[PDB]
Each structure stands twice: as C-alpha cells, then as structure tokens.
Design a binder for this molecule. Structure first.
Ligand SMILES: *Cc1ccc(-n2c(Cl)nc3cc(OC)ccc32)cc1
Ligand SMILES: *Cc1ccc(-n2c(Cl)nc3cc(OC)ccc32)cc1
Ligand SMILES: [Cl-]
Ligand SMILES: [Cl-]
Lengths: 9, 228, 228, 9
C-alpha cells in the first residue's frame, strides 16, 4: 500500500 | 544552528542539497528557514516536505530491515541497534511536528497551506505510530487521525475534488486507515469515493492540471487494486 | 565514541548497518572496531572498506553535482555549499588515512592484509586529489602514487596474477594513472598487462575463484574499451 | 572509467 511519493521537487 | 544564514540563502542551499541528494542537509536548511519565523510559500512548503520525507523514509526503511531481523531472532545487538534507529526516527518526527506546532499551522490561514501542514502532521504521527507499542500507540494514532480529519474537513469545503493536495491527503489518510487503524473497509471506501469524485471533475482541468490529478488518481487505483 | 562497546558487538552492528544501508553508522562501528587495537581479519577488512567507500562515494557524487553547478555559474551560496561538502569529504578521507597510519599498516605483515591497506591508502589519497587544487595537489598525488606502487610491488612478488586484491589494486592504480596523473598510456598498459597475465593463469582456478577473477577482469576490459 | 565497485559485502 503506497502513500504519496513526495521525495522529489 | 542556521541563525546566522540569510533565509534566502537557506532556501537556495536546500535546492542545491536536493540536487546533490543530500537530504539531511536539505532538512537542516529548511528547518533553519522555518525558524526565521516567516510563513512559507507553496514552493518552500514543498522543499520542507521533500527534505523530511526523504530523511524519515530512509530511517523507516532501515527500521523495517532491523525489525525483521530482530523478529527472526526471537545477543542484544539487533535490539540495541533497532532501538537506536527508532530513537533517531522519533527524533526527526518530533522535530517536524515541533516546526508545525511552532508556528507553521497557527499562522496558516489559506486552505492550501493549512491543509498541507495538517496532512504533514498526520503523516509524521503516522510514522510515529508505525514504531509505537501499546497504549502510547493509541494516543499517537488518535493524533494522526485528528490531524488528517481536520485537513479532510477543510479540503472538502475549500478545494475542488481534483486538487492534488486534496487527493494526496485522501490517499495518505486511506493508507492510515488500512495500515495503522485496522480499518481496511474505510480505506477502500475513502479511496473509491476520492477517485470517483476526481474523475467527474477532470473535464474542468487544463492539460497540465489533468496530468497532475490523473497521476495521483492512479496511485489511488493502485492501492484499490492491491486491497480488493 | 565506541570505547564502551565490545569489539564483537561493533562488528555485528557493522554487518547489520550494511543490511540496513546505514553506511555512516557502519563506518562509525568499524572505526570503533579498529580503535580496539587488534588486527582485522579478511572479512573485517572488507567491512571497513565497504563502509568508508559508501560514505565517501556519496560525498564524491554530491561534490561533483555541486562543482558542476558552480562551474556553470562562473551569489556565494553554491561555492559555500560545495566547500562544506568538500571539507566533510576531506575529513572522512583523513579519518580513514588516520586509521591506516594508526596502526593498521604497520602491523600488517601478510601480503593480503598489507596490499589491501596500501590499496586503501592509495584510494583515499586519490579521493583527496580529486578535490585538491594546486601544489597541494602535487604532494597528495605523489602520496597516492607511492602507496599504490608499494602495494603493486608486494602483489607482484607475493600473489598470483588472478588474485582479486591484486586485480583490484591494478584496476584502481590504472584509474589513478588515467584520471589523476594524466598518464592515459600508463593506464592502458597497466590494464592490458594485468588482464593478459590474469587470463594466462585462469586455468589454475576453481570454478568459484574463476568467477571472482573473471568478474574483475571484465572491469579492466570495460575501462580499456572506454580508453581505446 | 570505473574503479572497483566495493560498496557491497
Ligand atoms: C501530499 C502531496 C500531495 C500531492 C503532491 N503532488 C504530486 Cl505527487 N504532484 C503534484 C503536483 C502539484 O502541482 C500543483 C501539486 C502537488 C502535487 C505532493 C504531495
Ligand atoms: C579492492 C578490491 C579488490 C577486489 C575486490 N573483490 C571483488 Cl570486486 N570480488 C572479490 C572476491 C574475493 O573473493 C576472495 C575477494 C576480493 C574481491 C574488492 C575490492
Ligand atoms: Cl467488506
Ligand atoms: Cl599511444
């Protein structure tokens, strides 16, 4: 189950 | 620690640190920028979130590796080292939550900033809950739920159903329901309703906004595929 | 810093840190293990080298990103941040070189340990030379060359031409010639001679040793392909 | 030009 991939920008 | 550096220089160095994949530096620069006391622009909020999500993301991956080894073993070394990583992770989460409480949330009046910060507050309590054990877990879980719920209430009143912040908040709250709160049916219902209401609003969007909204909508679909 | 932890516990935690991709921790555990004062086994030497190569490898990648931005710009922020990363990298290299000098090399009497440590000494002076400017560069370059040369002299006398340490030393010394010393012809000649002498010795090897030696031999070939 | 990839084991 994936959360927001907020690792870029 | 960053008190002698200009706000604008801290922001510039945070962007350089992102390019160099130096996320601990990036987070330290953005902590210094927040502690200047001014509100953050949209881009600056993204820099703050990206920095800490990378730092805590590495800690979470390491904690999971060590926790798996520790469970497969049940000397003190594996537990000791898992505990060390866990304390470091808790310290980073506490730092982020401290920035949100002093004083980002209380000064955030526009929906886009306030929803963003409350989503962050839910996320970092969620990361605390992933490693918490017992009744401590209960209050931490309620803190995550309460932050996500306030963000949801604002987002439903103030943003269109395709707004990327609204969509990402719903995605992460659905993961909270599934993975933390043991509420898989609530997770599925929230993801389905979010996806369906966004679909019905796509006709209003430009090409660029359509790309952003449909990308996150696919993340909702990916979770629904795994959960059903 | 690690003085109160058992040597065996530091080694165990270094292995856990490798599994968790926590290379800074891994390097700190292995520094503590070296500072116990006992010689290192083959496996322990590998843990020390892997830890620091990962730490300094991340620093080198970041320094290259920042140096590229800094050159493309020619405010003070990019230079300031490149300098910060550079000083951190130099500090890690100095720490490794300090461990080799106090007292790993002087107690290393077998060819496999002494060649290994001297190759490390060449590598960390090479990383220092990558960021050095001027006549400082000259003495740093000579220090790398001298360490590699002593390692080469021992390896040619004491190890077969397929020995993986001997092969990796020759590979790295060839890179030193090509990238640092501005001696591409020496780099090519060393890589070719190393490859050819290893090929002629493969018939003596078991299946497992053959796999190890041919893998590194392919790295020599890959460089020769790029250089010719 | 590649040096030994000694980042594993
Ligand atoms: C928590 C969170 C929600 C959404 C996003 N996100 C993503 Cl992924 N892509 C985006 C594009 C945007 O353009 C305005 C805004 C937000 C976006 C990240 C994090
Ligand atoms: C500096 C250096 C040289 C060789 C190696 N290396 C590699 Cl790659 N694969 C190896 C297998 C071995 O088995 C005994 C020994 C050394 C090996 C790493 C680093
Ligand atoms: Cl059901
Ligand atoms: Cl020539």
């Amino acid at each position: 189950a994936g959360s927001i991939p907020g690792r870029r920008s | 620690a960053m008190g002698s550096m200009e706000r604008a220089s801290l922001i510039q160095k945070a962007k350089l640190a992102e390019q160099a994949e130096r996320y601990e530096d990036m987070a330290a620069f953005m902590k210094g920028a927040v502690e200047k006391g001014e509100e953050l622009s949209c881009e600056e909020r993204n820099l703050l979130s990206v920095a800490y999500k990378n730092v805590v993301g590495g800690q979470r991956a390491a904690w999971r590796v060590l926790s798996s080894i520790e469970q497969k073993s049940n000397g003190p070394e594996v537990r000791e080292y898992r505990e060390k990583v866990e304390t470091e992770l808790q310290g980073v989460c506490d730092t982020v939550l401290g920035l949100l409480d002093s004083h980002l949330i209380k000064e955030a009046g526009d929906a886009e900033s306030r929803v963003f910060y409350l989503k962050m507050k839910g996320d970092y309590y969620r990361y605390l809950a992933e490693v918490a054990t017992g009744d401590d877990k209960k209050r931490i879980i309620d803190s995550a739920r309460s932050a996500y719920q306030e963000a949801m209430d604002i987002s439903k009143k103030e943003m269109p159903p395709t707004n990327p912040i609204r969509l990402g908040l719903a995605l992460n709250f659905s993961v909270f329901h599934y993975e933390i709160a043991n509420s898989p049916e609530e997770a599925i219902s929230l993801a389905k309703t979010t996806f369906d209401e966004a679909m019905a609003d796509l006709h209003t969007l430009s090409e660029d906004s359509y790309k952003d909204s449909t990308l996150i909508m696919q993340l909702l679909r990916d979770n629904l595929t795994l959960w059903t």
